[PDB]
Design a protein around this nucleic acid. Structure first.
Length: 69
DNA sequence: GAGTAGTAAATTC
DNA sequence: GAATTTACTACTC
């Protein structure tokens, strides 16, 4: 009934979590084909499993798509 | 449009 | 020195 994270936090539509537990944000772009955006942190404050690469939380990537990239 | 599973390729501590 | 991540589609509701 609702998309939950790998713990107990509620994710917003469009967002979810791959199979590795990382966050994923799929969205139909103006091209006519879904777009994959990867991220381990839902916000730029959490952390990331050791061995994983660093990146701005999906909320920061998304903010670029909604603002003006 | 929303999300999943599987993969092809390249990269990293 | 080995193990891991990314990208798109295909199918589904």
């Amino acid at each position: 009934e609702k998309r939950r994270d790998n713990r107990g936090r509620i994710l917003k539509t469009g967002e979810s979590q791959r199979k590795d537990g990382r966050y994923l944000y799929k969205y139909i772009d103006s091209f006519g084909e879904p777009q994959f955006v990867y991220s381990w942190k839902l916000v730029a404050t959490d952390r990331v499993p050791a061995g994983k690469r660093d990146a701005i939380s999906l909320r920061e990537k998304i903010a670029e798509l909604q603002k003006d990239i």
